[PDB]
A = this chain, B = another copy of it.
Amino acid sequence: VARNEKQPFYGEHQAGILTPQQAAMMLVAFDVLASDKADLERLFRLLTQRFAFLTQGGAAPETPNPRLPPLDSGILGGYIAPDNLTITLSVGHSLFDERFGLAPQMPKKLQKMTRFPNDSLDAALCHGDVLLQICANTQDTVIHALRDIIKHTPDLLSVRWKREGFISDHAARSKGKETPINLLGFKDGTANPDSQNDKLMQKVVWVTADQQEPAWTIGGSYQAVRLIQFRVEFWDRTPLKEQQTIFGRDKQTGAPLGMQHEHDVPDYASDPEGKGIALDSHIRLANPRTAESESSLMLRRGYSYSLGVTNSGQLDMGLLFVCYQHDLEKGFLTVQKRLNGEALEEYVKPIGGGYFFALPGVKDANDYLGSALLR
């Protein structure tokens, strides 16, 4: 039964990273209003409490005294089903400024996101002290979580930016067995590293003790977020041949061009002029598939978005790109540097997002998010 699905909240790592993608999600960044490290700890403790309750489900908080605001928004009714909810907390570069004495604690590669050559960043949609990635089976559960978090933090958190996204229900319900199709009509996720292989994930996604990082970071992950708008109508009137040449993949099957099966692996060595798969194609640049490029593997966990219209009255739709990696410089920064100038660029418009560090897991009810960071 879908509404009763739960992902464990406690663990060595946060959920929402390796977790198979649920159908609905939200990215919401906040300014932190805490004035002391003390206030910050109270906030982190409070958040852990709210996330623990929401993700595992229970009866909605009641309001015995009606002269008070309702203790729950009510939008789910009387029972708060877990509905496969995960909440992942990450912290931005700006949390490590003067306010809370955490500067010495900053992850070695964490930085403020700065624009790439194809960027049109909107200042209202960038950065933040903290980001929550909130995913569940249904949008109702995600919004209810947000409203709960907000009601509990008037003194501590102020919403900075928010965007909601989705993947198809049936792809979500296959728990990774079927690749989601993005709003350009291409399968998106095919070449992701196996999130179930724990040794691969220890190398690819998680910060490990062997890295040159502050101790508290161990078991967390660097997180790059990009809000990317599509030129939908322009894309839809583009020849199929060109769409495929831009990506490097067959639209229908998802296979690398020239091959038969979605998950087949291209051989770039036997195609040095890119007659088969173009040298400026998205996948060839994202992953050159050389011995040296293997250090730039990442776990992508992106969602589609659809809003209203743009300022030109064209459809506002795109990608909430999210990726996790053991090292921000070796992962996202390296890959995007390779992607600069790719054929796709004229079709997409990065307008927002930022870089964050996803905290390590919370061990149990006596622990709280950020405990190692704050001590």
Which residues of A pack against B, CB within 8 Å?
Answer: 2-3, 63, 66-70, 73-78, 124, 137-140, 143, 146-147, 150-151, 154, 158-164, 166, 168-170, 181-183, 185-186, 232-233, 236-241, 243-244, 251-252, 306-309, 311, 313-315, 317
> Do A186 and B309 touch across chains, with their CB atoms under 8 A apart?
no
Known: A67-B240, A139-B306. 17 other contacts (CB 8 A): A2-B169, A3-B170, A63-B240, A66-B239, A67-B239, A69-B239, A70-B185, A70-B236, A75-B181, A138-B168, A140-B166, A146-B315, A150-B236, A158-B313, A160-B309, A161-B309, A164-B306
**Contact with A236, one of B69, B158, B185 (Cβ below 8 angstroms):** B69
Most buried by B among A158, A159, A251, A314: A159
Report the separation of the CA atoms of residues A78 and B147 in the bound assembly, to the nearest whole angstrom. 38
- Nearest opposing residue in chain B for A316, CB measure: B162
| A252: B residues at CB distance < 8 A | 74, 78
Report the separation of the CA atoms of residues A306 and B74 in the bound assembly, to the nearest whole angstrom. 16
- Nearest opposing residue in chain B for A187, CB measure: B77
Tell me whether chain A's interface is mostly helix, strand or loop, or mixed.
mixed
| A66: B residues at CB distance < 8 A | 239-241, 244
Report the separation of the CA atoms of residues A238 and B69 in the bound assembly, to the nearest whole angstrom. 5
Report the separation of the CA atoms of residues A69 and B70 in the bound assembly, to the nearest whole angstrom. 53
Give chain B nearest CB distance to A18 CB in angstroms: 25
Q: Assess A313 versus B143: contact at CB under 8 Å? Given A69-B237, A181-B74.
A: no
Q: Which 8 A-B pairs have the closest CB atoms?
A: A74-B185, A66-B241, A66-B240, A70-B240, A140-B168, A138-B169, A69-B237, A63-B240
Report the separation of the CA atoms of residues A313 and B68 in the bound assembly, to the nearest whole angstrom. 24
Report the separation of the CA atoms of residues A63 and B232 in the bound assembly, to the nearest whole angstrom. 18
> Do A143 and B183 touch across chains, with their CB atoms under 8 A apart?
yes
| A138: B residues at CB distance < 8 A | 168-169
- Nearest opposing residue in chain B for A161, CB measure: B309
* A-B pairs with beta carbons under 8 Å apart, 9 shown: A67-B240, A68-B240, A70-B240, A74-B185, A78-B252, A138-B169, A140-B166, A143-B183, A154-B237
Report the separation of the CA atoms of residues A324 and B315 in the bound assembly, to the nearest whole angstrom. 27
> Do B238 and A159 touch across chains, with their CB atoms under 8 A apart?
no
> Do B186 and A74 touch across chains, with their CB atoms under 8 A apart?
yes
Q: Assess A313 versus B251: contact at CB under 8 Å? Given A169-B140, A236-B70, A307-B307.
A: no
> Do B308 and A161 touch across chains, with their CB atoms under 8 A apart?
yes
- Nearest opposing residue in chain B for A178, CB measure: B77
| A63: B residues at CB distance < 8 A | 240
> Do B159 and A315 touch across chains, with their CB atoms under 8 A apart?
yes
- Nearest opposing residue in chain B for A83, CB measure: B169
Report the separation of the CA atoms of residues A191 and B125 in the bound assembly, to the nearest whole angstrom. 41
> Do A313 and B166 touch across chains, with their CB atoms under 8 A apart?
no
> Do B169 and A137 touch across chains, with their CB atoms under 8 A apart?
yes
